[PDB]
Point group: C3
Chain length 104, copies 3
């Protein structure tokens, strides 16, 4: 089963102007759900405007979601950002109180 | 021991108007500490205003904290949000430099 | 190898006025990359302004990065904040599509 039967958090920091394309890519890969945070950052003094996108996934392989975001967020210039995958141990839907991988 | 002797991050995305009730519920369950982030999101094009609540816990079972948030954040309409539990490997209190589960 | 050959997320919640000193400390320890989020919180009703700093690390020990942040963020008064270390399972550089610990 995808994600070894578990749940993963895909966290991407990307350019603000690529958010629209990332949203479209996520919808197209079948994992439209996302939470966006406005952030500031630097990679390798003054911080630049960035966007954090978070997608918790279970049914869709986390590497597939990461690839979709990366392809949509890419420009080829320094500052394009990074995607990280973190383990999630449980999930609860607030509306129903449903828990586990099927809660999403 | 609670949380199998470890530390967990409870991350909830909820409606902004439910934050006050969630804060009260967290205080009542004995885990008042929280960090709030203003975010935007969609579940299953335009993003809606949401709130992210993060609570790192050790002494209080993470599922108890999650249940408290879910009950307070519930309305029964689509958009109520989700709660995720993630593993935390260590914690440090900045004021004292105390580390581990007792750092909170 | 550092971080047991893996990748870690160091997440710190600190006073806003300490961000400049934390940035300098991170550069000095050799891990300048960071993402900053403006947040609100309380520790142990009204929430106070705080800053969340996130640093994903592989080459630099996560406890070294945490110590650098803690020392720079310290004042000795309640409200100084906390640092948490979370596991990260994978990373992707958007610009190159490079993956794994060497993606950072
Ligand atoms: N290791 C990291 N930890 C936390 N945030 C990072 C990390 N690497 C990159 N970021 C975030 O992604 C943004 C762009 O990073 P990146 O494209 O690596 O910058 P650069 O090309 O200048 O090294 C940064 O401004 C920061 O917000
Ligand atoms: N799998 C997920 N990953 C990231 N964020 C999510 C996920 N599911 C829900 N969210 C967040 O919670 C909010 C409300 O979600 P939800 O109640 O599931 O919406 P819906 O009922 O329309 O499917 C979303 O707008 C988003 O911010
Ligand atoms: N267990 C926790 N979970 C989530 N956020 C926390 C936690 N502990 C502290 N914080 C964050 O760090 C900030 C400062 O915390 P802290 O210095 O512990 O406050 P206090 O000294 O009043 O207990 C809080 O306002 C909150 O944003």
């Amino acid at each position: 089963l995808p994600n070894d039967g578990g749940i993963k958090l895909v966290m991407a920091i990307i350019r603000p102007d690529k958010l629209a394309d990332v949203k479209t890519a996520l919808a197209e890969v079948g994992a439209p759900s996302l939470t966006v945070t406005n952030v500031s950052g630097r990679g390798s003094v003054d911080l630049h405007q960035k966007v954090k996108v978070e997608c918790v996934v279970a049914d869709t392989p986390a590497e597939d979601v990461a690839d979709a975001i990366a392809d949509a967020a890419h420009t080829g210039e320094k500052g394009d950002g990074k995607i990280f995958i973190l383990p999630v141990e449980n999930a609860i839907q607030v509306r129903t109180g449903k828990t586990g991988r099927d809660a999403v």
